[PDB]
C-alpha cells in the first residue's frame, strides 16, 4: 500500500457500451464511465471513483 498508484485519463475508446444504463464499461481496467455525470467507478474495488488528475489516482466520489 504505497506504490502502484500510477493512473491517468482512462481510454474512452476502450470502453464498451452497456445498453441498460446507456454508459461505458472498460473491460481492461474494469472502469465505468459516463461523460454526462463525469464520474468513474471501478468495480474491482467496488468503488465509485473520480479522476482528480493531480493525485494521479482514482479518488472515491463518495462525498459525504
Amino acid at each position: 500500500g504505497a506504490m502502484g498508484t500510477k493512473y491517468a485519463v482512462p481510454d474512452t475508446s476502450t470502453y464498451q457500451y452497456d445498453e441498460s444504463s446507456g454508459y461505458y464499461y472498460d473491460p481492461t481496467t474494469g472502469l465505468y464511465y459516463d461523460p454526462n455525470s463525469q464520474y468513474y467507478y471501478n468495480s474491482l474495488t467496488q468503488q465509485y471513483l473520480y479522476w482528480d488528475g493531480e493525485k494521479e489516482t482514482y479518488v472515491p466520489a463518495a462525498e459525504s
Partner: peptide
C-alpha cells in the same frame, strides 16, 4: 443486487 451500475442510471 451486485456492484454499482455505470455512472448515470437516471430516468
Amino acid at each position: 443486487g451486485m456492484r454499482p451500475p455505470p455512472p448515470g442510471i437516471r430516468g
